[PDB]
Amino acid sequence: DKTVRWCAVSEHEATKCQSFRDHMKSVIPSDGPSVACVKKASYLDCIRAIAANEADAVTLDAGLVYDAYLAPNNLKPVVAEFYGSKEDPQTFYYAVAVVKKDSGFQMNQLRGKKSCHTGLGRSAGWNIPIGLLYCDLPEPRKPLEKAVANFFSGSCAPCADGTDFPQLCQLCPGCGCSTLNQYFGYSGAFKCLKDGAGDVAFVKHSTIFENLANKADRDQYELLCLDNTRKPVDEYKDCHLAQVPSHTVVARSMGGKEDLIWELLNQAQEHFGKDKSKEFQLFSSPHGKDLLFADSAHGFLKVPPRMDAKMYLGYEYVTAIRNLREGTC
Ligand SMILES: [Fe+3]
């Protein structure tokens, strides 16, 4: 069978996945690649499901791709999304910290503030900011969730445990790990800042431009720079926390159908990719942002032969994560 079982996290993604399935059936030959949908409550459940041969693919943030690699899962990156433009595809993006205009605090003054993270263990939303603030956190720093909880004065860290670290869910009770949680994801962490729930939104450099069409609105927001100064939302090239690997679709390291996934996605972007069809959009949805794939994506590129997760992620980022768990002050 030439069916790729895509793992959809929750109702919204499941809806987009079915439209995906049907629009593919309509253009692809009866003997080509097919998409089936398997529904789960979180990406974590999708990881376990792929490893257990109950699903074949899921799109993970680079930080999550690291954890996907760790046993007993042993997942591996197979197809990466690319951003920017089709001419100059960027297999990376900038981790930023969006704040409102005149909130009066720098990076070295986040202590006691309310934060909005895209999700626990994610690049721009958790690994980068928390890695930088690691020493600023009060002892003891293990568990890390407890220290981040006591550092800030309430926040939203989707996928975090709210019974053990209740404050990491003060801004989004339960820390839902899917779009069911309005504060989940890039645009979820943004809504959290925009709606007034939090003081800072640890998102990516394109987040605000995806949510606010008019510049006048954007003028009421600022970025937190490394040198503890603020720069407008247009100057992320210089005002960002770090640069991170693009989101990537993962699959089993053995019998994972990596080539079918490529053949599927490669065909998917040709018919429904960026500005390709008015009927179906691989990179957008009426039901929400970033479903299955990020809205800021312009396409896919196959990851090299048997490329490990540590090899893919690279050395700098793979150490950044490592230092986060390990490391001292
Ligand atoms: Fe990300």
Contact, 75 vs 49, CB < 8 A? no
Please give the distance, rounded to the nearest whole angstrom, from the Cα atom of residue 62 to the centre of ligand 1.
Answer: 6
Q: Are residues 236 and 219 in the same domain?
A: yes
Please tell me whether 247 is known to bind a ligand.
yes
Length of the chain: 329
3-class DSSP state of 9:
strand
Please give the distance, rounded to the nearest whole angstrom, from the Cα atom of residue 124 to the centre of ligand 1.
Answer: 6
Please tell me whether 32 is known to bind a ligand.
no
The DSSP symbol for 57 reads B
- Look up the domain containing 304 and give its range: 1-82+248-309
Phi/psi at 63 (5° precision): -70, -35
Nearest to 47 by CA among 85, 9, 19: 9
CATH number of the domain bearing residue 38 = 3.40.190.10
Q: Are residues 241 and 160 in the same domain?
A: yes
Please tell me whether 122 is known to bind a ligand.
yes
Residue 327 forms part of a structural domain: no
Phi/psi at 81 (5° precision): -85, 160
Q: How many Cβ atoms sit within 10 Å of the Cβ of residue 92?
A: 17
Nearest to 156 by CA among 104, 196, 96, 213: 196
Interior angle at CA 242, CA 199 and CA 10, nearest 5: 65
| DSSP per-residue codes, 257-268 | -HHHHHHHHHHH
Q: Are residues 236 and 144 in the same domain?
A: yes
CA distance 121 to 128: 9
Please tell me whether 221 is known to bind a ligand.
no
CA distance 234 to 223: 9
3-class DSSP state of 102:
coil
Q: Are residues 64 and 95 in the same domain?
A: no
In angstroms, this model's resolution equals 2.1
| DSSP per-residue codes, 170-230 | SSSTT--SSTTSTT-SHHHHHHHHHTTS-SEEEEETTHHHHH--SHHHHTTEEEE-TTS-E
Q: Are residues 118 and 208 in the same domain?
A: yes
For the chain, first and last CA: distance in Å? 53
Please give the distance, rounded to the nearest whole angstrom, from the Cα atom of residue 247 to the centre of ligand 1.
Answer: 6
